[PDB]
Amino acid sequence: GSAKDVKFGADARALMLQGVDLLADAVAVTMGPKGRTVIIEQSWGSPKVTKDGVTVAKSIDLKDKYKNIGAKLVQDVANNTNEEAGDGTTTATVLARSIAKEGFEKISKGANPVEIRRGVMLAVDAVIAELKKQSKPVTTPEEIAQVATISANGDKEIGNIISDAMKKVGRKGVITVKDGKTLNDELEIIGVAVLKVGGTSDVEVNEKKDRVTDALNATRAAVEEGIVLGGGCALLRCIPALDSLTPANEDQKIGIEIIKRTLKIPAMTIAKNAGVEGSLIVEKIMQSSSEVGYDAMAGDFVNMVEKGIIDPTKVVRTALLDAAGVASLLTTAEVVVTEIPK
Amino acid sequence: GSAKDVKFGADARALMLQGVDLLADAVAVTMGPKGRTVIIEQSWGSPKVTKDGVTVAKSIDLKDKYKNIGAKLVQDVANNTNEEAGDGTTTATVLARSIAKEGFEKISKGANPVEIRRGVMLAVDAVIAELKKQSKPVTTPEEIAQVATISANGDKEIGNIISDAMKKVGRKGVITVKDGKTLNDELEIIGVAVLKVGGTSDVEVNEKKDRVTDALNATRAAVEEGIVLGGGCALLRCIPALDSLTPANEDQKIGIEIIKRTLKIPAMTIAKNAGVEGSLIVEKIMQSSSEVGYDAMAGDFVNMVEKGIIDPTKVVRTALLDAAGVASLLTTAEVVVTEIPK
Amino acid sequence: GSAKDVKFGADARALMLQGVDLLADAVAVTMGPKGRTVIIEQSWGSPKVTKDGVTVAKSIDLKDKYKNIGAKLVQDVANNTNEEAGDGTTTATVLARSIAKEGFEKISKGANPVEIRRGVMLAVDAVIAELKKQSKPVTTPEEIAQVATISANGDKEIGNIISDAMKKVGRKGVITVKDGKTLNDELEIIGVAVLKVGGTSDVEVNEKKDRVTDALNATRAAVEEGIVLGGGCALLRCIPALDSLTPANEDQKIGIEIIKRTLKIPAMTIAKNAGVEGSLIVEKIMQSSSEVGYDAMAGDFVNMVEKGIIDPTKVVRTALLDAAGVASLLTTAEVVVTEIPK
Amino acid sequence: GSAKDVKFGADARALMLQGVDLLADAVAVTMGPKGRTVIIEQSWGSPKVTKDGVTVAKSIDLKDKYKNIGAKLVQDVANNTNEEAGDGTTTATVLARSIAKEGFEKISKGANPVEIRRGVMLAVDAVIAELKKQSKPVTTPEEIAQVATISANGDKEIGNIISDAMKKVGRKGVITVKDGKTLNDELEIIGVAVLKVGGTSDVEVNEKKDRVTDALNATRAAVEEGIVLGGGCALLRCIPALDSLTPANEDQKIGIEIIKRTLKIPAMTIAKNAGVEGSLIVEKIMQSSSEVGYDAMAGDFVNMVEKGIIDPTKVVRTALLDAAGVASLLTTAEVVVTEIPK
Amino acid sequence: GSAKDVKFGADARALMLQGVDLLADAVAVTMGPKGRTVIIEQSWGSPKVTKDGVTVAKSIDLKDKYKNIGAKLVQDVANNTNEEAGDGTTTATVLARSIAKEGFEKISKGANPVEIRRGVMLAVDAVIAELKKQSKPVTTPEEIAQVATISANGDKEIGNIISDAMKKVGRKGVITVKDGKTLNDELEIIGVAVLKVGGTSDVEVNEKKDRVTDALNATRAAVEEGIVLGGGCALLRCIPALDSLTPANEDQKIGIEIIKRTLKIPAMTIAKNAGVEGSLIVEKIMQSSSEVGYDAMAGDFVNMVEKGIIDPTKVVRTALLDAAGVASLLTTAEVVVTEIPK
Numbered sequence A, B, C, D, E: 001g002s003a004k005d006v007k008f009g010a011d012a013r014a015l016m017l018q019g020v021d022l023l024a025d026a027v028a029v030t031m032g033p034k035g036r037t038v039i040i041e042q043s044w045g046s047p048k049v050t051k052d053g054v055t056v057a058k059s060i061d062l063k064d065k066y067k068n069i070g071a072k073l074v075q076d077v078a079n080n081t082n083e084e085a086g087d088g089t090t091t092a093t094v095l096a097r098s099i100a101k102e103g104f105e106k107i108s109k110g111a112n113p114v115e116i117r118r119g120v121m122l123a124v125d126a127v128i129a130e131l132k133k134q135s136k137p138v139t140t141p142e143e144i145a146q147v148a149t150i151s152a153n154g155d156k157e158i159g160n161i162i163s164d165a166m167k168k169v170g171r172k173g174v175i176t177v178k179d180g181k182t183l184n185d186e187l188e189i190i191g192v193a194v195l196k197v198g199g200t201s202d203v204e205v206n207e208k209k210d211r212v213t214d215a216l217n218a219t220r221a222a223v224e225e226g227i228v229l230g231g232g233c234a235l236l237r238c239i240p241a242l243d244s245l246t247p248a249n250e251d252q253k254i255g256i257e258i259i260k261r262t263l264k265i266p267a268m269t270i271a272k273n274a275g276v277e278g279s280l281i282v283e284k285i286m287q288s289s290s291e292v293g294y295d296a297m298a299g300d301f302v303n304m305v306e307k308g309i310i311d312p313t314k315v316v317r318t319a320l321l322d323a324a325g326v327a328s329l330l331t332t333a334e335v336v337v338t339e340i341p342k
């Protein structure tokens, strides 16, 4: 029997979107090889340093309960992505924000948001089918090293260590990670491989451990499903698969167009983090052949297959699906009910 | 034991009607195939998204106690409808709001509210009788699939899986709904039928669980009693039977007119949620034959039975019965006693 | 479920830097033979007077959480330095302040802070390599007395008693120091050598105990690893190594220049605390021969090894490594999450 | 005598850039043929509806004195542009905001804002010289008709009436526009051409008054100096001029690149107000043939001069000059002194 | 009459020094060829942008009366410098600030601030005697051009035009400056020469004519008395004249030391504003040859008289005298009384 506050329509949608945008910015700053970090205040002592997107998402709550609803929903998106794969939480968050934003923009009296959500789901199914079609399997230790290096912010040593551990204990053997008291990283087997991470301080060790865990999750996903073009170009090459779709009604077309517009968000964010204009980069990615992407680290155009800029199919698929499933549902909102602050 | 504030007559009635209007609008935004959802903040964790009238009604409260009284009465309407039939709580809420508003409008110095209550109960019994008269028994599993699809907001897969479970376990069997961890809905029998609803997150799986529970309850009511016209056309065709009823006095005439103008509310709300004027649609429905109605999804006029838009008799009869039984009693209030805030 | 406030980019960086500056000044008013002490209030009783960097660092906590974050990070620098070397906490803190300040100064839209951090790590690795190259082993108890006297703020009796105790018990023996109930320091062996610290009050004996503990830790570090030029001249002589580095991209250039400009900080601050202009002293140190440094106590440019102004190699390398590892990580921060002050 | 408030560096820089951003955004929303109207409340009577850049600029005032400083500087830019040409105040506003932002971004400890301003002046001189070099004189009444129509938000009747007035009075004749009292425009000469605006209310008449005055000033400037490519394409085609410039040192290069990025702002803003992305439109204009630009109404790429989209050379050159001269001076600011509000 | 507030000694000195330092920094930020401009809010209209020291000095008033006292005293320094020479107001500002600081620190219970002032006066008269014995008469129109260029922020056109005007109307002839209407400045004689300063907006012509006025005053002083080394170098070179002085008492020695340390402040400030450190640069200037000075524009050491960076003897000597006379008297203050704010 607690007093509640009721908001209708556009005010509620805008108040959701404010929190969604705040959390999505705070997460998306940590995207890509040029991405930066986030300092999170800790109550029990030293603040923690995390480039990990889902930690940034889960570490943010907003006083306004209306904005807190959207913040907690994008937090749920990121948490589901982490629970399913363990990487690409930033990509899932930016996709969720973009889908929710485009859904809120195209809301009117005549627009049926439920059929828009149905169209979003249909387009997501089609693009996941295209993703599985385009993916290729892993057949080389060099590919494992590349996956672990790209997943760990370009740390060649971490990629080499993970590749060595996978070679030593097999691609299915158990590997864990724990902090080492040394200044460098060492691998020992006593089998089951255990990775000991070195660093000059607890915060640096924690950050490197997060990167190592991300790389390990990505390489396990790669061996489980396969790899696709990295740098967000997998979505940018699956985009034509939506043009072959024939929507049933208008709202289906609205959903398909919204998903097609959101497909280029990850490449836009990756380019934007590297001090350049995202839209031109996405345009040139699409104009290029099916084997050319933008190397965000070096700031030029290369062949991603040769350069080792690749990502697992599982990460991108789960990120896109988890973002769509929650963002489209939030789009169907008309009334929000929050508890009055006491 | 505590100080109480007392209000007399019209001001108190308006104060209660304010809360009834707030709750009724916040629930009626979720009526019809083109209806939308309501976001409800949950203290322990992720906010929930629902398209169910009873939960939205139960998840609201107001600081003002005079409004909260009407809010609690209409909450009782929705809860009793859900407990008795498991479906049609939003229709119960809108009928309760309509009856309460009409009763409050037609109160004068000489008008006896109790005899208006007697007249409205007489009219409700009459329309229940004619609703039973125009009922149709369920004889094919195709009608089962149609009822399940209609009750689940135009979901073909939910209706098909409900029909398959109905065919396998038997019409009078036992069905239990549990949330599956997969991305697809699965049916298993081990026999007791079990539906494993699937989704990519907790909010989607909870919403789909609500929809499948509504479909199950609607189909069970259909097999128990029968089916009548969908889209609010059952009451809309029971309307012309009130002209055959004569009141004993003027108050019963007022109550009969209250039911007469109330029976149009579900169709008007269904049309209005589709972004169109309800009144013209309802007038064309009356002008049309005894079988033609308005399909709110396709936005045209079709033979309701042949297009599968059908509805259980029990749901409508109990929703109208309970909404009347509570709102009419709310009409007869003159003095209201509420506690002083502490 | 606690609400947080998010600050982006330059404002958050400046807010952290203000707290870093406050704590670093409060710590850096101490180091050098002419440095001053700090009075820290003790709630349970008499206050404490200390000339030790880590005590000042730990004892200082700020109100605003954005300043408190930088305060806790420089606290981590000081504590890690104290735990790994037992000396040079003030040097580590001033190096952390300088690295963080310079890195924040060079943060731009077109800059990649992660590659700046990589360049910083390469520069500190080269510097520590040259520092190890320039180390000298300990062969005489005279060098032991010199190290003890230098790390005891020029107290000759402490150095003499430490050298005599290490002569009696051995250079790898077990020495512990405790308070003395007489008016002077006395050494007793029973075996494990025990030092009793004399004084007329709790504050005097506590400060002398801290100084003699610093002397013991520095002397043990010297006997384990070696000694180098004191007065910060080790890093000044290590400066030329960085000029031979040929990094890859501009961000590594920036990081290497950060380290090169940070190497001058200890000598500059030691000179500044003496009452003279630090920059002129440090420049005259660079121009002079490899064996000539500035005697802050005497205010003259003298032979460092002949005068006996020497410091352990392990202490200097530990301080520099910890300061780099923490401050450079703090450099790469753009988004900051802090709890609301409930 | 009056107590003053002083701020240093980046804090005040961001403070007045906030006001510059606010005023320039309010001005820019009205740019292009798809720009909208700004409603300004009037103390005397009915609020006015305006599409005029300098009017909105002068109508923007802020309580914050630091933001008000930048607001009044951009007001000064718009006012000087209106005084010297009477058209293109929106272009001057957006160019000035772009230059102020770019100058504020690229300020460091060693950066020299004054020499950056000198380089901005050098680039401005080069762009103005190339505007003169590519300028084409007006030879037929169709061209002045097109210029009047384009400057009148594509009002064909306004341009036709102005062309008739010009052909009846002459290229150098005196034309004045006065308030009209009927519903249709009428041109009469009693000599001096006088135009009466046809409107239905005061505010509509004022809006068309602004439009017709802008069109008349556009015709006067076009016949004074000449015509170049419209739609902001002149600066895009003049961009290659800066490629041949050799800066004296780094600061002039910074200014040259600031102007180079700024030269794309008008076309980008015209595209953005059309509802599409501006960067890709600008890039397509730059890649495509020099004689083909972007049309905002049809949203396609056609020949600008053949389609009538042309601008007076005087208008664009004075907009660029007035914007740059004050924005680059705003860049040089380091300390800001304001009065304490009282 | 009205109630007063009285403060004794050190706290009052610190409060005054706070405002002195604030205004001194706000003035000295502009100093040097690489200095930046100050924005001062104007209540009557457009804000002003200036690079002149005395305008910023006059335009700053402080809420605290104790700080305002020192602010007004250094304002007196600036105004006296402007009224006597019209140039070098920032030099006098920084000299007075340094003298105030060094007199505020070097005061003890047994010291005699009156005798300290007398020693300061003796040092200053010796310094001005050395300056007059180190001057060189202007015997070349090219020298006039160099002086005009250097005193006008190194603008070649302004210096050349001033040289041409002085050649046309005679060295002692009258020159007047007024703002023009076109974009470039012109000189005309009808004799009396009028310099029509050109520009784009009000702020540009205002600060341009301020710079031209400063250059004209410097030129007049150069013709009247002579020229000396620029960049504060002559004050550096006159320090050895102080070393020959034997103070009568200890406090005269204190004052001589104060002036001796102060004599380096202008060069330090010029170097500091140039993005480089100042102490080592001025030390290298003292070490280098007599004619060698630091060219802060090119960032190197050159024979400065040959490069044309020259300053008038009268400007330098008057600035130093006006700074010293006020500051050495200010340091003598022990008790300050103020009015109670109301």
Ligand SMILES: Nc1ncnc2c1ncn2[C@@H]1O[C@H](COP(=O)(O)OP(=O)(O)OP(=O)(O)O)[C@@H](O)[C@H]1O
Pocket: A030, A031, A032, A033, A035, A051, A052, A053, A054, A086, A087, A088, A089, A090, A091, A092, A150, A151, A153, A214, A230, A231, A232, A270, A294, A295, A296, A297, A298, A309, A310, A311
């Ligand atoms: N040098 C590079 N050039 C282009 N794309 C790159 C480069 N390095 C990494 N990427 C891509 O950028 C993304 C890496 O982003 P990032 O590591 O910040 O977050 P994430 O993978 O979404 O997940 P998480 O937030 O959990 O780390 C991946 O899609 C990866 O393929």
Ligand SMILES: Nc1ncnc2c1ncn2[C@@H]1O[C@H](COP(=O)(O)OP(=O)(O)OP(=O)(O)O)[C@@H](O)[C@H]1O
Pocket: B030, B031, B032, B033, B035, B051, B052, B053, B054, B086, B087, B088, B089, B090, B091, B092, B150, B151, B153, B154, B214, B229, B230, B231, B232, B266, B270, B294, B295, B296, B297, B298, B309, B310, B311
């Ligand atoms: N496609 C359709 N066109 C027209 N009317 C429809 C259509 N589908 C369902 N209806 C009608 O709309 C109503 C369904 O309302 P809704 O699904 O919002 O909830 P409800 O039946 O009131 O109850 P609950 O909220 O418990 O599910 C029924 O009267 C049904 O007959």
Ligand SMILES: Nc1ncnc2c1ncn2[C@@H]1O[C@H](COP(=O)(O)OP(=O)(O)OP(=O)(O)O)[C@@H](O)[C@H]1O
Pocket: C030, C031, C032, C033, C035, C051, C052, C053, C054, C086, C087, C088, C089, C090, C091, C092, C150, C151, C153, C154, C214, C229, C230, C231, C232, C266, C270, C294, C295, C296, C297, C309, C310, C311
């Ligand atoms: N007499 C001296 N002359 C010159 N340099 C000295 C002298 N004594 C110490 N130093 C230098 O000062 C630094 C030592 O500083 P100090 O003893 O105050 O504390 P610390 O080692 O920085 O740390 P902590 O305060 O935790 O003990 C070293 O760089 C050392 O070489």
Ligand SMILES: Nc1ncnc2c1ncn2[C@@H]1O[C@H](COP(=O)(O)OP(=O)(O)OP(=O)(O)O)[C@@H](O)[C@H]1O
Pocket: D030, D031, D032, D033, D035, D051, D052, D053, D054, D086, D087, D088, D089, D090, D091, D150, D151, D153, D154, D214, D230, D231, D232, D266, D270, D294, D295, D296, D297, D309, D310, D311
């Ligand atoms: N149909 C069009 N296609 C392309 N560019 C157009 C079109 N119509 C106008 N423009 C361009 O838009 C600009 C005109 O902007 P607008 O009419 O908003 O006012 P303005 O000239 O900027 O000045 P003010 O706001 O003071 O009237 C010019 O650069 C013109 O070339």
Ligand SMILES: Nc1ncnc2c1ncn2[C@@H]1O[C@H](COP(=O)(O)OP(=O)(O)OP(=O)(O)O)[C@@H](O)[C@H]1O
Pocket: E030, E031, E032, E033, E035, E051, E052, E053, E054, E086, E087, E088, E089, E090, E091, E092, E150, E151, E153, E154, E214, E229, E230, E231, E232, E266, E270, E294, E295, E296, E297, E309, E310, E311
């Ligand atoms: N290019 C230069 N190289 C070296 N010193 C220079 C250079 N330009 C100017 N200076 C020195 O800097 C000072 C000139 O500073 P500035 O013109 O900003 O103000 P000012 O002389 O203090 O006074 P005012 O504000 O009245 O002009 C002089 O000491 C001059 O010698």
Ligand SMILES: [K+]
Pocket: A030, A031, A032, A035, A051, A052, A053, A090
């Ligand atoms: K991330």
Ligand SMILES: [K+]
Pocket: B030, B031, B032, B051, B052, B053, B090
């Ligand atoms: K419903």
Ligand SMILES: [K+]
Pocket: C030, C031, C032, C051, C052, C053, C090
């Ligand atoms: K110390």
Ligand SMILES: [K+]
Pocket: D027, D030, D031, D032, D035, D051, D052, D053, D090
């Ligand atoms: K406009």
Ligand SMILES: [K+]
Pocket: E030, E031, E051, E052, E053, E090
């Ligand atoms: K100046």
Ligand SMILES: [Mg+2]
Pocket: A087, A088, A089, A090, A151, A214
């Ligand atoms: Mg990642």
Ligand SMILES: [Mg+2]
Pocket: B087, B088, B089, B151, B214
């Ligand atoms: Mg229902």
Ligand SMILES: [Mg+2]
Pocket: C087, C088, C089, C151, C214
């Ligand atoms: Mg020490």
Ligand SMILES: [Mg+2]
Pocket: D087, D088, D089, D090, D151, D214
């Ligand atoms: Mg215009």
Ligand SMILES: [Mg+2]
Pocket: E087, E088, E150, E151, E152, E153, E214, E215
């Ligand atoms: Mg000057």
